[PDB]
Structure 1
Amino acid sequence: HHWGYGKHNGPEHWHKDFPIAKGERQSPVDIDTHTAKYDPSLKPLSVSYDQATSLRILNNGHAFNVEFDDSQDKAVLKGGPLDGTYRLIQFHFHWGSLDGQGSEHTVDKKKYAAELHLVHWNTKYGDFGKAVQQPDGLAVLGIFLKVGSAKPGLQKVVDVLDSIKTKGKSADFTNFDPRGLLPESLDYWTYPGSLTTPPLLECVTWIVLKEPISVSSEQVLKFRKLNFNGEGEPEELMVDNWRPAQPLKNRQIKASFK
């Protein structure tokens, strides 16, 4: 009986094994666009993904992760609210059973169809496992997906999902370029928060982009065909793997734009 997204193991049960679920800096949250403070001291984000090396894609039973070689400074995020260099280690998505839910973060209570998380750890700490222990250890870039037009650069991702259908499966996934997932503008809101899965550590600077990307209905449909189970236990579709909004408590959301 370990954690998941169902009735008996879902986000509302998490606090029993992971008490920090009820903490002071839990994510995700609702971004109230009228209460967010424009802060003109924030610099533009600097995203340097030219030398990125993708290695592998896996179904870990809660999402699918595309993993990158983080042994050197090859795909890095700097600037913004960040001091220092943060290395890309993985990206993953959260998505819904239907097009009107799926994102974790909300914008004036509006849900998007999915949310992309690009996970970066602060090189000052030397590896990811030490990073998650620090208040400034991680930076995740969150990008919202709405359904409209196809995103061509997501297509290579969708075509291999057939090969990692069940929990535990993994496939070689080289030469994928994460630039094809970025929207046009890099304006953002930022606030201090947490991982949105267990262990829910409060180690994250969140950078949530204003501009959504578009994917097609057919594209998100293929995400929905994945399984939370291993081969073949009874089939449970991997859908609605999102944690709802958590209390903002004593936190300010800052915007890079007005």
Structure 2
Amino acid sequence: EWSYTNILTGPETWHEHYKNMCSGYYQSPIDLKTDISTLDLKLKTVIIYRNTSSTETTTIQNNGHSAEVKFPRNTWFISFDGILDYKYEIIQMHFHWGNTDDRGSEHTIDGFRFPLEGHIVSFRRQMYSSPSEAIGRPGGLAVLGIMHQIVESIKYEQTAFKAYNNFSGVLNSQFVPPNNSTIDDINLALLLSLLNPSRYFRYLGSLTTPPCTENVLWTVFIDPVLITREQINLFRNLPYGSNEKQTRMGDNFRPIQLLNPIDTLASRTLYRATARG
């Protein structure tokens, strides 16, 4: 078992409890350094798109470590090449946040932490026929990281919670693990339009929870979407699972890893994208 807040099973111990692959040298998250990174003009605008034929329901679960939206199969997709041919299929979205407004994200941008980081998880359908085939195999996954920032003055309609449909009001103190509820579908395309989908960091890394598999193509958008203090506080109402020391869910982020730990056998590079200027 693992946790974020119990020192016996917490992030500092993952490298020993889950050597495959939390002891690896292509771990995530990392500090996304604007100065150090390599601008690669070939990396294209990200597109998220829906299959309009899909009618299946979306659900959300308190899994004890995060709030996790589970999307139905064959519904939401990512394109990184401008073609809408289902190369990447979205599986779930979950969130990492802080006890306080000045931390919570897993990635940092030039050392800066955001209050909330969302992770849209997809599998390389182009190669693998199902999520469960992809999740443990090389090159199986692509995750999008969406930073959120708190503003004081904003209409609900322009916040990320409009795309999320407030998660159908499920984020509250009675949403205890491992409860799951049906929720309204999440408009992921609207969510993406709240930021610049051409402006992002790109690197090869890992899942950020055990077993930290090193099979994730990461894309982290630089511009945040916007939320309110009221909205962040809804997440903080969720209870942690019983293996955590802290009662309410918060600080559910993994500490920063190095792009290239000293023991690396082949260095990786951090890339950056921007719009055809």
Aligned equivalent of 1:221, options 209, 218, 233: 233
Runs of 4+ in 1 over 4 A off after TM superposition: 80-84
Percent identical: 34
| Aligned residues between the structures | 253
Unmatched segments (≥5 aa) in structure 2: 261-266
The 3 A distance-change label for structure 1 pair 171 and 61 is same
Once the two structures are TM-superposed, the CA of residue 177 in structure 1 deviates from its matched residue by 2.0
Report the equivalent of 1:28: 29
Once the two structures are TM-superposed, the CA of residue 80 in structure 1 deviates from its matched residue by 5.2
Q: Distance in 1 between matches of 2:237 and 2:49?
A: 32
Unmatched segments (≥5 aa) in structure 1: none
Q: Work out whether 1:243 is the aligned partner of 2:242.
A: no
Normalising by structure 1, report the TM-score: 0.90
Letter in 1 for 2:62: N
Report the equivalent of 1:102: 104
Task: Please provide the CA RMSD for this pair.
Answer: 2.4
Letter in 1 for 2:186: F
Letter in 1 for 2:128: Y
Alignment of 1:11-26 (within 5 A): 11-19=11-19, 20-26=21-27
Once the two structures are TM-superposed, the CA of residue 78 in structure 1 deviates from its matched residue by 1.7
Q: Distance in 1 between matches of 2:168 and 2:103?
A: 19
Letter in 1 for 2:164: L
Q: Distance in 1 between matches of 2:166 and 2:116?
A: 17
Report the equivalent of 1:136: 139
Q: Is the 8 A contact 1:158 1:222 kept in 2?
A: no
Report the equivalent of 2:60: 57
The 3 A distance-change label for structure 1 pair 254 and 208 is same
Once the two structures are TM-superposed, the CA of residue 234 in structure 1 deviates from its matched residue by 9.4
The 3 A distance-change label for structure 1 pair 193 and 235 is closer
Q: Distance in 2 between matches of 1:153 and 1:44?
A: 20
Q: Work out whether 1:185 is the aligned partner of 2:196.
A: yes
Alignment of 1:200-211 (within 5 A): 200-211=212-223
Q: Is the 8 A contact 1:76 1:85 kept in 2?
A: yes
Q: Distance in 1 between matches of 2:147 and 2:246?
A: 28
Q: Distance in 2 between matches of 1:235 and 1:244?
A: 17
Report the equivalent of 2:78: 77
Q: Deviations over 1:194-231 (max 9, x none)?
A: 0001111011000111110110000000100101136x
Q: Is the 8 A contact 1:103 1:113 kept in 2?
A: yes
DSSP 3-state at the match of 1:223 = helix
